[PDB]
Amino acid sequence: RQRRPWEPPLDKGTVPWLGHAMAFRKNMFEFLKRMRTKHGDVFTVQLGGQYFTFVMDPLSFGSILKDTQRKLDFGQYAKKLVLKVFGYRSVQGDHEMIHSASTKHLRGDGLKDLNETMLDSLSFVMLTSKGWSLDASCWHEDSLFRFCYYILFTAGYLSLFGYTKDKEQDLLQAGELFMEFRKFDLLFPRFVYSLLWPREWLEVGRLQRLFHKMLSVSHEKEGISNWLGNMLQFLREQGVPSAMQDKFNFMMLWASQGNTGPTSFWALLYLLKHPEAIRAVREEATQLGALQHTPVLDSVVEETLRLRAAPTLLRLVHEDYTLKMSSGQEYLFRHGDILALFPYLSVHMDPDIHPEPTVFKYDRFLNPNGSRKVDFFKTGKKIHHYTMPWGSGVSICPGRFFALSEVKLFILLMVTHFDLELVDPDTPLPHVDPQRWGFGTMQPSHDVRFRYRLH
Ligand code: HEM
Numbered sequence: 001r002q003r004r005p006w007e008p009p010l011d012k013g014t015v016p017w018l019g020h021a022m023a024f025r026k027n028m029f030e031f032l033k034r035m036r037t038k039h040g041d042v043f044t045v046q047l048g049g050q051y052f053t054f055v056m057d058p059l060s061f062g063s064i065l066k067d068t069q070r071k072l073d074f075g076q077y078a079k080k081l082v083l084k085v086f087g088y089r090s091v092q093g094d095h096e097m098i099h100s101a102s103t104k105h106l107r108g109d110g111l112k113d114l115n116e117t118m119l120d121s122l123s124f125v126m127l128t129s130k131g132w133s134l135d136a137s138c139w140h141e142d143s144l145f146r147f148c149y150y151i152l153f154t155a156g157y158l159s160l161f162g163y164t165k166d167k168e169q170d171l172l173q174a175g176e177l178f179m180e181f182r183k184f185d186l187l188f189p190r191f192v193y194s195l196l197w198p199r200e201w202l203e204v205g206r207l208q209r210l211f212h213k214m215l216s217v218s219h220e221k222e223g224i225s226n227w228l229g230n231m232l233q234f235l236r237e238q239g240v241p242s243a244m245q246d247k248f249n250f251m252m253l254w255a256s257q258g259n260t261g262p263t264s265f266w267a268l269l270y271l272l273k274h275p276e277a278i279r280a281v282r283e284e285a286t287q288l289g290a291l292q293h294t295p296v297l298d299s300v301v302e303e304t305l306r307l308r309a310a311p312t313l314l315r316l317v318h319e320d321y322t323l324k325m326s327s328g329q330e331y332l333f334r335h336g337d338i339l340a341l342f343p344y345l346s347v348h349m350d351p352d353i354h355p356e357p358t359v360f361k362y363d364r365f366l367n368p369n370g371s372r373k374v375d376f377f378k379t380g381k382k383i384h385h386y387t388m389p390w391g392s393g394v395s396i397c398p399g400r401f402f403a404l405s406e407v408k409l410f411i412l413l414m415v416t417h418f419d420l421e422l423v424d425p426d427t428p429l430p431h432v433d434p435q436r437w438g439f440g441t442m443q444p445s446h447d448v449r450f451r452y453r454l455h
């Protein structure tokens, strides 16, 4: 590839025939930081087979996301990724099925019917696996990350993929599945990057075949979410075999449980590390369908996602795309190239939009009167895209409302019915594990111990 004057700069790396794959996969966040300062806001690099063009100017996010014409497509790239990782082969129309099923059953009425079960399942799991002793004041030490993740995963799994007659048995396997899910989740970025030791490729194979069987469409379950059954109806109706339906189910299990848990971890952890904040939500909590009446919690969860939701927004260009920068410069993107945004660096951590951006400020999105603050600026200019945990366009997360009910209910239940303390409130928060930069909600570099007991 030879660059044309009208294209953005093309950086081939100091050592050519190697590129930036090594520095990119190691710490994507730091790699893009260096590139922004070196080439400015728009630059192109080769990763894997593809050529990627990054746009770091938040002001230009406007036209790109409102793809007025038909030029950018998220699904053409995503289907390649899920094929490698889950072996699911996209069929004509499944992209629209998912969104229809989601708008219909993960929003409005579908969502409240579902939220009622999620609450039921989250209460049952907390109580049953709580841990007990003959002494009623006994503290119980656990690991906060594994704790939150196991809770959201079990309740999420049972609310979506169905429960059975024996509700204790459900929990037991749900926990057994969790352990194996966590093993798959941990290898996932390196799987996407093919940076696995030969033994690890086998583990990913075993985990695949394992979930395929547990979630198999032949396997007695009652009351599965309308979201899932609606989607399998489409698949069976288009002649999708059952084996491929099993691969579909595993992909949706990972999609629906992959971030909700880790996001709960950071929120509760930020709340424990800021007495100011945990009291505001506890008090809001004390005083059914009240999830829409928690402005304080709402802002605690936006701020958490601002600090720990670091996805990449990828679009394949299938017709030559022309981007005009606020500056006054035009840039041409070739069809076949991957358009990429990293709103974490461009938006979340921009000090002009969010002063002291690396600081958890539970009230960051609250107006002095407690109303919702939706007015943010970069040097006088209004930024409609001030937080971007879900993305935008026709590919914005169709489960973001469920995820939010999921996380909000967990927090409320925890801060209400439990005494919480960090084993070591003096040590610094774990930093993001850099190997997952760009894949959704970040995960801690190391777990933190915490103790809990009832009131
Ligand atoms: C904190 C939790 C979550 C976060 C941070 C998150 C974030 C995201 C992001 C950034 C995207 C890509 C947006 C884009 O490319 O424009 C996405 C897409 C998607 N999300 Fe989520 N998500 C979460 C939870 C969930 C849940 C619970 C589900 C299902 C129940 C789900 C299902 C999906 C699906 C199927 C897509 C595919 C995009 C498409 O429809 O083309 N996500 N999510």
Ligand SMILES: Clc1ccc([C@@H](Cn2ccnc2)OCc2ccsc2Cl)c(Cl)c1
Pocket (backbone or CB within 6 Å): 078, 081, 082, 251, 254, 255, 256, 258, 259, 311, 312, 314, 397, 438, 439, 440
């Ligand atoms: Cl089926 C599916 C739907 C969305 C995704 C999101 C992550 N996610 C998962 C669940 N909710 C959000 O992918 C973002 C992303 C990061 C690097 S490449 C790439 Cl795509 C995936 Cl991985 C599979």
Ligand SMILES: [K+]
Pocket (backbone or CB within 6 Å): 075, 078, 079, 090, 095
């Ligand atoms: K898809």
